[PDB]
């Protein structure tokens, strides 16, 4: 059963996304009874319509975390994406507003794996060696990265099927125009079962990726963490998952261990109870934003006053920038679009315009002629979290203007394709904005490896406290982050379990 006030637990993992799922798997396999505390719900119970998740075409209360309206980056575009009113509910996608950026995050058992596009990319070794020089890259490349990819269930699309299917016409068009401008394109591996997708196209199985589902969950096909790491962790019989509990405070307990305060909420987000449990070891896996907010609050409120001054520093947005281009009539993108991106434009090696851009679907169900892109740029800008005395809240200092360096990098590539194709940008996808620069899907940093923590995620001032999630990464990895977070967690857990436990 779930955690009760007064309980004493060997290992408590806060959060159940990538870092938390790796921690839980490795701890329980080591034979350590482990409690995961997750603020969202378990997504294994059908809603009204008999399905677990809602699709993007007709979202309902299941879409958003405690909100009165849906929120998608593309709004009111040709019948698609219009924000509708919903009941407040513990829905799957949180659009967390800070002053200069909104951070999209998954909420529920599996964290971001529930809502993400499944793109599983291993960073370039050269860049990896440069941004994380304290990490033994041989171990990462010979062992931890492969371990992560295999554990996550990464697979590749059948390229012959890709070429023929109407569902990926948008990607073929995006590839064609990138290549005509001299840019390199690459297939991108994914945790979505591509064999299942072929059956979807054949009309043989329930459509998910071919049925307008992704950011509010996938009823089928996508290997979210509850199907991989967490299923394996639960299989040991040593895992307990406590859902609908938000951790609010961590402080040294008397005698040993740490007191963990949590708010139990009902499905409407009302706090129904407050509990305190004592844990010998605590693994922060609440995500780049969640972990940073917790540690910054704990330090500023005098609960963990000895934390490093580096706590809260070095947050980045993985240089996320979105943009859409108009194609001419002969470069249709298709009325049937898979929701799972499979193709990227890799220009990272170009020091003048270092970007990796995925060709994203805009599944509106009609021909829009739009090529949509999500670009990861090598934006050097960073921000920090800081506790605000007046409000009792943690603020993020990121300013929207800090995205300008990323836009300039992206522009260099997209302007070149626009010149070759004689096309213009769309300005109606995001308030007459061309560049989608006020949100990120990829928050990274805040509690940097070997800066705020030791070289393995330990908080040295408080033995037994560990950080295992995206807050460790220095703001940008040059590709979709989850494979990196998983592999880094794999590395750290290996050392912690072998050294500390
Ligand atoms: C819409 C979307 C699309 C994306 N697409 C891709 C993609 O295709 N490929 C890729 O590599 N990455 C992608 N990402 C990013 C990827 O999902 C994240 O990098 C990744 O999930 C971060 O892992 P994490 O373990 O750090 O934290 P998360 O996965 O964010 O998990 C944090 C967990 O902790 C829980 N939590 C938070 N605070 C508390 C608290 N105080 N108490 C209890 N529980 C708490 C949260 O509810 C959540 O379940 C995308 C993200 C989104 C949101
Ligand atoms: C690119 C991304 C977000 C990144 C994911 O990995 C894949 C993905 C699929 C559908 C896209 C979404 C961005 C926002 C979009 C464009 C919408 O608003 C509806 C469809 C959505």
Residue recorded with tokens 């739009």: 370
Upper half-sphere CA count for residue 144 (Cβ side, 13 Å): 22
Element (H, E) at 320: strand 320-326
Distance between CA atoms of 43 and 74, rounded to whole angstroms? Answer: 25
Ligand 1 within 6 A of CB of 470? yes
CA 139 to chain centre: 24
Active site (annotated) includes residue 442? yes
Residue nearest to atom 15 of ligand 1 (CA): 442
**In the structure encoding, which two tokens stand for residue 163, read together?**
């070429």
Residue 134, classed as helix, strand or coil, is coil
Q: Residue 362 burial (CB < 10 Å; 0-12/13-18/19+)?
A: buried
Distance between CA atoms of 39 and 96, rounded to whole angstroms? Answer: 14
Q: Of 437, 464, 476, which is closest to residue 354 (Cα–Cα)?
A: 476
Q: For the chain, what are the domain ranges?
A: 7-152+215-319+382-398+438-500, 153-210+320-381+403-437
Distance between CA atoms of 215 and 197, rounded to whole angstroms? Answer: 17
DSSP letter, residue 412: H
Distance 21 CA to ligand 1 centre (A): 11
Task: Specify whether the CB–CB gap between 107 and 40 falls below 8 A.
Answer: yes
**In the structure encoding, which two tokens stand for residue 447, read together?**
């509690």
Ligand 1 within 6 A of CB of 194? no
Ligand 2 probe mutation, 105, 117, 211, most atoms within 8 A of CB: 117
In CATH terms, 153-210+320-381+403-437 corresponds, of 3.40.190.10, 3.40.1190.20, 3.30.410.10, 3.40.50.300, to 3.30.410.10
> In 245-283, which positions are buried (b, 16+ CB within 10 angstroms) versus exposed (e)?
bbbbbbbebeeebbbbbbbbbeeebeeeeebbbbbbbbb
Distance between CA atoms of 357 and 77, rounded to whole angstroms? Answer: 22
Task: Specify whether the CB–CB gap between 471 and 445 falls below 8 A.
Answer: yes
φ, ψ at 212 (rounded to 5°): 75, 25
112 is known to lie in a ligand binding site: yes
Contacts of residue 302, defined as CB under 8 A and 6 or more positions apart, other chains included, come to none
Query: Following CA atoms 344, 350, 354, 355 in sequence, which dihedral angle do they give, to the nearest 10 degrees?
Result: -10
Helices assigned H by DSSP within 133-243: 137-139, 145-152, 159-164, 169-180, 194-201, 229-235
Sheet holding 102-106, edge to edge: 93-97, 102-106, 439-440
Angle between helices 404-421 and 169-180 (to 10 degrees): 90
Task: Specify whether the CB–CB gap between 101 and 398 falls below 8 A.
Answer: yes
Task: Specify whether the CB–CB gap between 112 and 482 falls below 8 A.
Answer: yes
Residue 378, classed as helix, strand or coil, is coil
DSSP letter for each residue of 197-214? HHHHHTT-S--STTTT-S
- CATH of span 7-152+215-319+382-398+438-500: 3.50.50.60
Catalytic entry in 313, 358, 421, 490? 358
Q: Of 490, 33, 65, which is closest to residue 241 (Cα–Cα)?
A: 33
CA distances from 49 to 59, 217, 489 (A): 12, 15, 37
Distance between CA atoms of 41 and 409, rounded to whole angstroms? Answer: 39
Task: Specify whether the CB–CB gap between 262 and 59 falls below 8 A.
Answer: no
The angle formed by the CA atoms of residues 290, 294 and 298, to the nearest 5 degrees, is 175
Distance 442 CA to ligand 2 centre (A): 13
CA 181 to chain centre: 31
Distance between CA atoms of 500 and 457, rounded to whole angstroms? Answer: 12
Q: Residue 164 burial (CB < 10 Å; 0-12/13-18/19+)?
A: exposed
Distance between CA atoms of 145 and 123, rounded to whole angstroms? Answer: 9
Distance between CA atoms of 295 and 291, rounded to whole angstroms? Answer: 6
How big, in percent rounded to 5, are the helix, strand and coil portions of the chain?
A: 25, 25, 50
Distance between CA atoms of 415 and 17, rounded to whole angstroms? Answer: 37
Distance between CA atoms of 335 and 155, rounded to whole angstroms? Answer: 26
Distance between CA atoms of 447 and 283, rounded to whole angstroms? Answer: 13
Distance between CA atoms of 424 and 54, rounded to whole angstroms? Answer: 34
- The β-bridge partners of 374 are 322, 358
Q: Residue 45 burial (CB < 10 Å; 0-12/13-18/19+)?
A: exposed
Distance between CA atoms of 94 and 156, rounded to whole angstroms? Answer: 29
Task: Specify whether the CB–CB gap between 219 and 52 falls below 8 A.
Answer: yes
Other residues' Cβ atoms within 10 Å of the Cβ of residue 389:
8
Task: Specify whether the CB–CB gap between 312 and 295 falls below 8 A.
Answer: yes
φ, ψ at 395 (rounded to 5°): -100, 155
């Amino acid at each position: 059963r779930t955690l009760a006030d007064g309980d004493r637990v060997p290992a408590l993992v806060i959060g159940s996304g990538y870092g938390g799922a790796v921690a839980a798997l490795r701890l329980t396999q080591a034979g350590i009874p482990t409690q995961i505390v997750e603020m969202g719900r378990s997504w294994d119970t059908p809603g009204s319509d008999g399905k677990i998740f809602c699709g993007m075409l007709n979202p309902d209360k299941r879409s958003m975390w405690l909100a009165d309206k849906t929120d998608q980056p593309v709004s009111n575009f040709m019948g698609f994406g219009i924000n509708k009113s919903i009941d407040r509910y513990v829905g799957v996608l949180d659009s967390e507003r800070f002053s200069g950026i909104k951070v999209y995050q998954g909420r529920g058992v599996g964290g971001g794996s529930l809502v993400n596009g499944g793109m599983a990319v291993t960073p370039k070794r050269n860049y990896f060696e440069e941004i994380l020089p304290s990490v033994d890259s041989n171990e990462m490349y010979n062992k931890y990265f492969p371990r992560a990819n295999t554990g996550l269930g990464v697979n590749n699309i059948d390229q012959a099927w890709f070429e023929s299917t109407e569902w990926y016409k948008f990607a073929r068009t995006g590839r064609k125009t990138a290549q005509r401008s001299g840019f390199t394109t690459a297939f991108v591996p994914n945790v979505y079962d591509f064999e299942y997708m072929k059956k979807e196209a054949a009309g043989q199985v329930t459509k998910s990726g071919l049925g307008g589902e992704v950011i509010y969950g996938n009823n089928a096909g996508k290997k979210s963490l509850d199907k991989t790491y967490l299923a394996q962790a639960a299989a040991t019989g040593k895992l307990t998952i406590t859902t609908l509990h938000r951790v609010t405070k961590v402080a040294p307990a008397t005698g040993s261990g740490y007191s963990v305060t949590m708010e139990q909420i009902d499905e409407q987000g009302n706090v129904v109870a407050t509990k305190v449990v004592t844990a010998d070891r605590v693994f922060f896996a609440a995500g780049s934003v969640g972990t940073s907010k917790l540690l910054v609050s704990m330090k500023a409120q005098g609960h963990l006053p000895n934390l490093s001054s580096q706590v809260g520093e070095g947050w980045g947005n993985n240089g996320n920038i979105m943009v859409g281009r108009a194609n001419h009539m002969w470069d249709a993108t298709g009325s049937k679009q898979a929701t799972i991106p499979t193709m990227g434009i890799d220009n990272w090696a170009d020091p003048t315009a270092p970007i990796f851009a995925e060709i994203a679907p805009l599944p509106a169900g009609l021909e829009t002629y739009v090529s949509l892109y999500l670009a990861i740029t090598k934006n050097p800008e960073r921000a920090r979290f800081q506790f605000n005395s007046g409000t009792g809240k943690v603020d993020l200092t990121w300013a929207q203007s800090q995205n300008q360096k990323g836009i300039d990098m992206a522009k260099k590539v997209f302007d070149k394709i626009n010149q070759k194709e004689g096309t213009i940008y769309r300005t109606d996808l995001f308030y007459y904005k061309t560049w989608g620069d006020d949100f990120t899907y990829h928050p990274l940093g805040g509690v940097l490896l070997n800066k705020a923590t030791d070289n393995f995620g330990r908080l040295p001032e408080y033995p037994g406290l560990y950080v295992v999630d995206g807050s460790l990464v220095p703001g940008n990895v040059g590709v979709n982050p989850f494979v990196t977070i998983t592999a880094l967690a794999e590395r750290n857990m290996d050392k912690i379990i072998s050294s500390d436990i």
